């Protein structure tokens, strides 16, 4: 149960890197919304960033947290210099997809998918 | 090929090359679109004897690679992967352009 660290010895500086990445994403969201002419507002873009972080927040392996930080830096840098376009940014919101309600009655009425 | 002699001389002088000798438009020298039927030959294995497949099964002669050294299984002069490459000779036909 002993492995080689990637960047972080334990969860502490891994969480420090998480906080730095979240800080820079929070900085970049208004610039993203202003530059790429997004229909969304600044508030819900920051909410999207925050709930992405909370989606990934359940992991406590330092290597996995380091790799998630690395991938977040790639996504953020890809947003800094604008290669990721308006469609790629708006892919985070799924506004064109009808969501699937999680109740048994609705999943029974639609089809056989559990 | 239907060009007059005046236009042919003008083209030859203007390009510096003999153009009527090598025309890029094919007129009659190409092969006929209808050909006599062929008869393709057969290969070396088309024989009725001494042709057992085990004697010519190249696919089954492949062996697993020979382990030179393994970490679990396993004064001399230094060597190279091959003798050094011989220097290329200059072209005797046209060495320079």
């Amino acid at each position: 149960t002993s492995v080689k660290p990637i960047f972080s010895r334990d969860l502490n500086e891994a969480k420090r890197r998480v906080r730095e990445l979240y800080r820079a994403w929070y900085r970049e969201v208004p610039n993203t919304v202003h530059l790429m002419q997004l229909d969304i507002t600044v508030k819900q873009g920051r909410d999207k960033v925050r709930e992405m972080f909370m989606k990934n927040a359940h992991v406590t392996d330092p290597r996995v947290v380091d790799l998630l930080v690395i991938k977040g830096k790639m996504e953020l840098q890809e947003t800094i210099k604008v290669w990721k376009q308006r469609t790629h940014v708006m892919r985070f919101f799924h506004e064109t997809e009808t969501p699937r309600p999680k109740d048994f009655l609705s999943k029974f009425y639609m089809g056989h998918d559990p | 090929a239907s060009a007059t002699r005046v236009i042919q001389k003008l083209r030859n002088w203007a390009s510096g090359q003999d153009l009527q000798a090598k025309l890029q438009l094919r007129y009659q020298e190409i092969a006929k679109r209808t050909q006599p039927p062929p008869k393709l030959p057969v290969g070396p294995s088309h024989k009725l004897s001494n042709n057992y497949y085990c004697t010519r099964d190249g696919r089954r002669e492949v062996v697993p690679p020979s382990i030179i050294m393994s970490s679990q299984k396993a004064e001399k002069k230094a060597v190279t992967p091959a003798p050094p490459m011989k220097r290329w000779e200059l072209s005797k036909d046209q060495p320079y352009l």
């Binding site: - | 970490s71 679990q72 002069k77 230094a78 050094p84 220097r87």
Partner: protein, 113 residues
Amino acid sequence: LLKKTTGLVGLAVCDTPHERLTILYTKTLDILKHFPKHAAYRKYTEQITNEKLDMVKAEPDVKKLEALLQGGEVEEVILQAEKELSLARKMLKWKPWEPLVEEPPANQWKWPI
């Protein structure tokens, strides 16, 4: 005479190829003397360095020296000696004569699965 060009872009023409090769091989031997005695890299690199130094000292002609060394042109031989010296320093830092660092898993190199 002197070579007008080496035939390779970005490679200069060395007007003193014997002295440069001599000092490069001497520096290579001197840095190889710091290696452990049982180092196979030290033994082999000393073998090639000694052979090439002997051939350089034996042949004073540039073209015959290139034909003897058969490593391209003498400028390429000088560049290879420089890279061998840097590699000798890197081997001395890395110490690869030690035993195997960590055994691979049991089916790490088993193909096919």
